[PDB]
Symmetry: C2
Subunit: 56 residues, 2 copies
């Protein structure tokens, strides 16, 4: 019933859902980048511990 009205709604909702999906994925990439940078940070500190304390 009222198929013309169903379609107006579903198009607008699809545009909003696509924006929402894009925002969600950006939030996920920010968290992923935080976890990546934390691992890189740890590895750089170990590298620099060796360089500071190794015998010369």
């Amino acid at each position: 019933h009222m198929w013309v009205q169903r379609v107006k709604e579903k198009e607008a909702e699809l545009k909003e859902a696509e924006k929402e999906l894009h925002e969600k994925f950006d939030r996920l990439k920010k968290l992923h980048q935080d976890e990546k940078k934390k691992l890189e940070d740890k590895k750089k500190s170990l590298d620099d511990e060796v360089n500071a304390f190794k015998q010369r």
Copy 2:
């Protein structure tokens, strides 16, 4: 001695490299899922547009 502490630090560095690999693999599965979800929305919009155009 034989710089055993340096060998230990390099093992820890290799553990972090493995952890980066696992993070990359896990994040790729989340990317694939996001790509699936984006394609799903696009095909909803396509079929709606095609249904609408079918009349005109």
